Amino acid sequence: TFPGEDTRIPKRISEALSHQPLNHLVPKRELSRLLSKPVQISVQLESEDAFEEVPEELWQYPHPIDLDPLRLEQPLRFRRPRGARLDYREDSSEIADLPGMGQLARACLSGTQLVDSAAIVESIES
């Protein structure tokens, strides 16, 4: 005889190949793809700031100014980043204590409530 004759073991190389993955043919395509994506492309006009400076004293205005005198009740929907590892802790500071942001900007935040988590979504159905 010869060892393994009369067993199930594949004796021809084509029969044995059906149990051997072609492991020298290695996929490489997804390699090029993680580089080929310039994160952003954009056209921009080179031009002077069209909006004049205000008097520096007016930056000391102490009272809240109402931005939005109507519209957010069509509330805006925001993009919740796919793949974000998000945690739940209130250990962080309040919004009007965040840097930075000047003092009129902090005052205009007073009274407004936060964006609801419901308004921050990965996607819509429309």
Binding site: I13, V39, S47
Partner: protein, 605 residues
């Protein structure tokens, strides 16, 4: 009363400036956002910005330069950070209309570009990118070839065309060559970006890269005013071409060594600004093209290239360095501190998540080459078809494999939009079918239908292969010639296929001989399975001498001990046992039989 007077008098400008502050504060907060509370705070700050911009846009009669600035910034913030693409379109639409009654030509096109590129991108729908192509052709027709804006809208078009790459491959490519010709006169930086995009698109579709395009590609890193981030990309893309062709990358590794030394400390901006004409720039956000990120990905590239020589304690580069790129990429992800928007911070994090998932993919691939099972299971990657491929391979080399399940896995992959994955799937299906035909017992009518399945399979495999870049890949070329032979001669198959005439026969036999002679003594990558199958075919078909036949059958029998392939090592062993008997080598017959005896033990249990 001066305060009250300033308040009402400079209200518009003041709110426009508050808006910028909320946005600065959001950019500061973005990379530290780690909780739901912080996510809400972040979008409360950008909401505050948008009310601000809207307050200026909706509530005042603006000059045209004021309207341009505020409207484009509003649209940009809404498209990037909100789901309000309709709102953005409305605002851009209003500006488009005002701009027609003015001589402000460049501004008008800038808005059109936002409607034709940025808006269909924000809609996340390929079908939206295809209707774009009609509006860009209209614009292009009206403009001269020397016009910067003709180049940009033509690039809008190539992007619209890139959606639906079915026979679309021909058009996109003609379109890039036309754009490259238009832009080769113009700004050298814009030409570099278009060139890089084309070679990337070719790599993505795995189609052959014309020599002249690679010459142009390499010329980008010449001793030139090309932005350094595009020179790097050009070098990375050159490496990838050699890696897709399974070529030696020694020289390209030195070019990297020159580039990293010649250009050190370059500090380093993540954005390239190209001036395409007086008054307008194109801005490329490229946060991977810097010293640390390229040293890291170059290591991954280097790993994939040597992956197959993981059996050898000399070029087992992949084993030493994949755990390093895995660690580095998780560090780069955690230490990310860029001052940009949250979606842009998560976009950079997602690339490091992809690097790590490819790392894990290639680690598993290496483990399956050297053993039957991977210690710890096969990892779930974000690449779902790479999962199916890993499931298939490990199932195929199991002790008692289920070949009807292996078949279904490899068939799913023959329907993949990845052309490389398709090829891999068809190649494996073919080997399964050939093994069915070889072991058939059904008589003339059964043998005949399986024969016909095998030739169908073989043709599907050949058509896929001949229309890809891998024709210039010698690992693939040698193995297509081997797969041809194993179905067509009687030791290898039990029912070989016979054809008329063929000229196919002289094709692949020339090839097999060409590879076998040059790789016995441009020579192939040194993948064990590939040289095993080459030497076994060659030793059986092409060698006359009995002592040389013994050299080869002994070499092939020992190969099967250097990595996991018991079935191959077995058939090399019975070949060697018969060669050692005809050669009347009586000691060697003794030990081969002894090895073989323990071999069948392990395989049968």
């Amino acid at each position: 009363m001066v305060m009250a007077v300033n308040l009402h008098k400079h209200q518009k400008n003041l709110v426009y400036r508050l808006s910028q502050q909320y946005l600065a504060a959001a950019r500061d907060l973005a990379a530290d956002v780690r909780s739901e509370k912080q996510l809400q705070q972040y979008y409360t700050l950008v909401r505050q910005c948008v009310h601000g911009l809207r307050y200026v846009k909706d509530g005042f009669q603006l000059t045209v330069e004021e309207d341009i600035q505020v409207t484009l910034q509003l649209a940009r913030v809404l498209l990037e950070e909100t789901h309000e693409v309709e709102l953005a379109e409305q605002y851009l639409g209003s500006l488009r209309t005002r701009l027609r009654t003015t001589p402000l030509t460049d501004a008008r096109h800038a808005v059109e570009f936002q409607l034709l590129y940025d808006v269909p991108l924000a809609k996340e729908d390929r079908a939206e990118l295809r209707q774009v192509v009609r509006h860009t052709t209209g614009l292009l027709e009206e403009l001269a070839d020397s016009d910067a804006w003709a180049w940009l809208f033509r690039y809008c078009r190539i992007i619209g065309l890139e959606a639906g790459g079915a026979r679309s491959n021909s058009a996109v490519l003609q379109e890039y060559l036309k754009l490259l010709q238009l832009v080769s006169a113009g700004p050298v930086g814009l030409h570099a970006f278009v060139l890089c995009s084309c070679v990337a698109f070719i790599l993505d579709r795995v189609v052959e890269l014309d020599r002249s395009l690679l010459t142009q590609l390499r010329a980008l890193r010449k001793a030139t005013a090309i932005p350094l981030q595009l020179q790097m990309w050009s070098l990375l893309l050159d490496l990838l071409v050699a890696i897709q062709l399974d070529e030696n990358i020694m020289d390209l590794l030195t070019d990297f060594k020159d580039f990293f030394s010649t250009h050190k400390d370059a500090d380093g901006d993540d954005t390239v600004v190209l001036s395409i004409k007086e008054g307008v720039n194109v801005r490329l956000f490229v946060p991977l093209f810097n010293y640390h990120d390229c040293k890291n990905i170059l290591l991954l590239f280097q790993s994939v290239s040597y992956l197959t020589t993981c059996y050898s304690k000399s070029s087992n580069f992949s084993t030493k360095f994949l755990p390093k790129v895995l660690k580095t990429s998780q560090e780069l992800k955690e230490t990310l501190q860029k001052r940009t928007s949250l979606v842009h911070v998560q976009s950079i994090r997602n690339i490091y998540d992809k690097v790590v998932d490819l790392c894990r993919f290639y680690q598993t691939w290496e483990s399956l080459i050297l053993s039957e099972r991977v210690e710890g299971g096969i990892p779930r990657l974000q690449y779902s078809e790479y999962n199916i491929l890993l499931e298939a391979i490990s199932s195929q080399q199991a002790q008692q494999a289920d070949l009807s399940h292996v078949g279904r896995l490899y068939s799913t992959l023959t329907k993949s939009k990845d052309p490389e994955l398709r090829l891999i799937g068809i190649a494996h299906l073919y080997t399964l079918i050939v093994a069915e035909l070889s072991s058939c017992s059904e008589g003339p009518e059964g043998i005949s239908e399986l024969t016909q399945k095998t030739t169908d399979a073989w043709e599907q495999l050949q058509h896929a292969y001949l229309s890809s870049s891998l024709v210039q890949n010698n690992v693939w070329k040698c193995s297509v010639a081997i797969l041809w032979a194993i179905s067509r001669f009687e030791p290898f198959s039990g029912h070989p296929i016979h054809s008329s005439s063929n000229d196919q026969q002289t094709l692949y036999m020339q090839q097999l001989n060409e590879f076998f002679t040059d790789n016995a003594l441009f020579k192939l990558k040194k993948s064990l399975l590939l040289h095993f199958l080459l030497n076994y075919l060659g030793g059986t078909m092409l060698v006359s001498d009995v002592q040389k036949r013994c050299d080869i059958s002994s070499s092939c029998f020992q190969m099967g001990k250097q990595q996991y392939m018991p079935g191959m090592r077995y058939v090399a062993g019975i070949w060697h046992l018969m060669n050692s008997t005809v050669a009347m080598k009586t000691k060697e017959v003794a030990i081969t039989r002894a090895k073989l005896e323990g071999l069948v033990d392990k395989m049968l249990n």
